[PDB]
Amino acid sequence: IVAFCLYKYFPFGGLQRDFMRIASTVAARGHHVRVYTQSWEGDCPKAFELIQVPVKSHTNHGRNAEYYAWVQNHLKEHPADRVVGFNKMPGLDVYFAADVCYAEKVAQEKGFLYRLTSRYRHYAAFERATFEQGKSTKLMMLTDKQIADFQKHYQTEPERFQILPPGIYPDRKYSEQIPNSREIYRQKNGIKEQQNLLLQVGSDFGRKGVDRSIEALASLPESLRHNTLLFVVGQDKPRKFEALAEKLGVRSNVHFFSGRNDVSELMAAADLLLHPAYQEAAGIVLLEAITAGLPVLTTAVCGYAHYIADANCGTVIAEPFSQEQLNEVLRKALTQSPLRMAWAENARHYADTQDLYSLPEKAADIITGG
Numbered sequence: 001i002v003a004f005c006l007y008k009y010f011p012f013g014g015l016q017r018d019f020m021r022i023a024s025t026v027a028a029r030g031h032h033v034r035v036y037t038q039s040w041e042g043d044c045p046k047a048f049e050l051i052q053v054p055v056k057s058h059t060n061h062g063r064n065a066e067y068y069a070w071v072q073n074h075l076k077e078h079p080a081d082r083v084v085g086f087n088k089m090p091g092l093d094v095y096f097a098a099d100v101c102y103a104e105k106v107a108q109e110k111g112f113l114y115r116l117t118s119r120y121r122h123y124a125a126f127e128r129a130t131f132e133q134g135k136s137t138k139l140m141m142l143t144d145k146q147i148a149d150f151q152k153h154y155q156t157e158p159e160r161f162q163i164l165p166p167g168i169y170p171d172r173k174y175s176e177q178i179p180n181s182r183e184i185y186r187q188k189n190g191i192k193e194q195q196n197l198l199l200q201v202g203s204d205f206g207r208k209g210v211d212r213s214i215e216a217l218a219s220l221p222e223s224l225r226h227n228t229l230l231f232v233v234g235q236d237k238p239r240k241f242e243a244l245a246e247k248l249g250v251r252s253n254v255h256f257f258s259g260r261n262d263v264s265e266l267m268a269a270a271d272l273l274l275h276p277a278y279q280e281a282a283g284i285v286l287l288e289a290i291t292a293g294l295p296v297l298t299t300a301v302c303g304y305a306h307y308i309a310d311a312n313c314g315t316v317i318a319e320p321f322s323q324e325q326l327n328e329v330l331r332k333a334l335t336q337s338p339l340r341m342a343w344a345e346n347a348r349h350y351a352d353t354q355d356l357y358s359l360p361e362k363a364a365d366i367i368t369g370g
């Protein structure tokens, strides 16, 4: 019996999609998969034993604490052979690092008033419980930067870390698309042959720099701008970003969508992925774009930004972030189709020659070992 703990399941998050693929891999090896969550949106594999954990606190942090306590009591009466968490909490045998190091985030960005909160104390305590010395929890990591951060704040025993290769779903790959996918999916989405489709995918618009993408769109020269659209796709509220698009006179150019299940089609249809995130532990969409043959503009803060430079299929905007640099890079990329075509080819080549896929098998090995 392998128990999985994540606070919330829904289809439009990387943490959730990585969990689904890892847990499905574990189940397919013959183990019984039990899932504890506060809430579950979308389909659930019939193999899974799904347990909804009742909570009543009025804050995320309070509910998380209640969840941990309830799960511990349930495990006391119904033992599992291994407990695997996708969120930081006590009691895990294995943790998957979908998040950044919270202690480092706070140290770098926050001050005294931020640290006064019960919210801070909780998240710090649950991270500490996972990473501190003396714990047995195996730590499945996405980036070397994550490891450096956790070592800095917790002096975690180095042997407990294991970096995983990426785990991009094969259905995003250019070679897994129907013939004429670009034309078909452009037509499906109302994109004209001559238009530029910019694509931004992710369920945290603010964190992922949707504002930066809108600013970049707005900065384009008049004629180019008139031929350019931006699709913003994810389970988040568009309100603030609609207001910004109106402010900048590009409201009609920007199309907002809730969570979509057709991201593979959108990447086949698009001309550039924009992902100028403020914070991103890794960024699965960056590598999805690589596998789709979709060139990428992103920021150096993203854990997976280096892959864009490695694949030579876009531009990584350096820190400190310059909006003017992103604006110029966008204008250049859009006006230089030969550059974009070369980037796309480079992306496809990298996707064909690099392991961007095996994460769930390697994570399942760690989970089921022994």
Ligand SMILES: O=c1ccn([C@@H]2O[C@H](COP(=O)(O)OP(=O)(O)O[C@H]3O[C@H](CO)[C@@H](O)[C@H](O)[C@H]3F)[C@@H](O)[C@H]2O)c(=O)[nH]1
Pocket (backbone or CB within 6 Å): 011, 012, 013, 014, 015, 016, 017, 018, 097, 098, 099, 201, 202, 203, 204, 233, 234, 235, 258, 259, 260, 261, 262, 263, 280, 281, 282, 283, 284, 285, 286, 288
């Ligand atoms: O409307 C939508 C919106 C998204 N998706 C999919 O959800 C995934 C999003 O993962 P991504 O790593 O890009 O961002 P995020 O969800 O913030 O992931 C966290 O967890 C990730 C690790 O699990 C980590 O990479 C990241 O840094 C964390 F913030 C990616 O596979 C998208 O194609 C979708 O299908 N439809």
